Structure 1
């Protein structure tokens, strides 16, 4: 029993729920969502030490 309330806006992914499987997050420190599931992009694996969500990456579709 701990039930915190400090985040006035909990959950953020396209799944709107956290603490399930593994996690990522768009490396943009101004991302309005911050974290994303390894299946909110269908990653299944670690991409690199730099990633972007399917909205941050859409701004530079260059392959």
Structure 2
């Protein structure tokens, strides 16, 4: 029932977590953030990365 990501849809497939504890989204679907395989190390979403 809960939704996530920039697409605001339910969880599905592989999800990646934003490493900014103050992130307003926290979890994203891999494809929505252009990922096929998980990146190494800490990762920050597009919303927290941009100005």
User: Quick check: TM above 0.5?
Assistant: yes
Q: TM-score, normalised by structure 1?
A: 0.66
- The match for 1:39 is 31
Q: Which has the higher strand share?
A: 2
Give structure 1 regions of 4+ aligned residues with deviation exceeding 3 angstroms.
Answer: none
Count of residue correspondences? 51
**Unaligned ranges ≥5, structure 1:** 1-8
Q: Which has the larger radius of gyration?
A: 1
What is the aligned-residue RMSD (CA, Å)?
1.8
Q: TM-score, normalised by structure 2?
A: 0.78
